Amino acid sequence: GEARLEEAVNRWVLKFYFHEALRAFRGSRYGDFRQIRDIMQALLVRPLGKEHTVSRLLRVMQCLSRIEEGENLDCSFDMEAELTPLESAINVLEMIKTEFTLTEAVVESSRKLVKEAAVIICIKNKEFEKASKILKKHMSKDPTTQKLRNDLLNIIREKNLAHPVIQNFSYETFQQKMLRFLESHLDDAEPYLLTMAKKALK
Amino acid sequence: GEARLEEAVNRWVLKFYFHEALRAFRGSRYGDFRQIRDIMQALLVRPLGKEHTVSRLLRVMQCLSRIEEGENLDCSFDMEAELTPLESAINVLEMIKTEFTLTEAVVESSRKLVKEAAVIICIKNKEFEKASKILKKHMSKDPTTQKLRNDLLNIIREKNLAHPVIQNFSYETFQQKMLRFLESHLDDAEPYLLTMAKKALK
């Protein structure tokens, strides 16, 4: 009882803060986002009862968290590996695809965005070695992925930070792009807690 | 200082048991392998000293553990995802490749093996969608495997477990090869401990 009661509030609290997290990300207030992220993280140790109820928003939160830290290459989200935040975002994208039962046609366009960003950020930070690794391992294949891949290699082999593919890539643009992709896969309903804060204050 | 003594022993114990685990695996003695693996797991929460000396050891152990469990699909080594043991084995393989400084050329033949068995096993198991999933994510790619992508692909839609590919597939045969592969990038030895048992079983 008193226990099934915390679970219900923990559910409301999780959902409410995820919304504020999206609002902050949407407004480019990444510090606020990170702060709400830590609140949500601290909350995960507590009982939530109905997993399947928070599971989707949690996977989106995960992707966003790795994307928000995408420029801190010394930051990692793997116990097991040496993965840059964006490489980790990719894995989340795969989980999201499976647990949201999404088609490849829908996921692939945004996944190519994350690979592009993962390689370029490495490049901008001058980790041409990490870049080739990520490039070789991820856009290793071939369709359209055929021109950007080559350009990138050439930019890498040449340590060419001045190339236009590098010079015109904006992490901000990329971030907002991924938020829009992830938002279109969620039911954007108003959190109970917010509805009450509205009854409550007005 | 009483602490750095424990560290030294814990290191001897890990190395000794890793040695016995390979022995057990080598003898297709998988139950013993599993009991030794759990011992090593319980050993990891303890002070090991410096991680330059057991990290290759540890990675191969991970790969083998995931492989020895590959037929149980409801078993998972991934913390975040619903991954079959063989999918998690691929990821370990990747860390091994990165940390052992091997080339794609040296590693592609084994990982290839892993992709195959991961699918076949899903198939030999009536799990046809995962089979499709794993194939489209890992094999729906390279050159010299198209013929196979296409055969495993049809075997899927027709549910042809009656297929030469499937019937002549041998996991025991699979396991042993993987061990042979992983062994060739590891020393051979006698762990201080085993050496001292003989020096006394004297």
């Binding site: 992220r37 830590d38 949500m40 993280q41 995960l44 140790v45 507590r46 009982p47 939530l48 997993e51 928070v54 599971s55 949690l58 996977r59 939160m61 995960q62 968290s65 830290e69 010394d74 930051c75 990692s76 989200f77 793997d78 116990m79 935040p85 | 913390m79 975040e80």
Partner: peptide
């Protein structure tokens, strides 16, 4: 479990 904190890890391990 609470692994939900590990399974849905929102923060850098680091």
């Amino acid at each position: 479990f609470r692994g939900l904190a590990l399974k849905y890890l929102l923060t850098p391990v680091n």
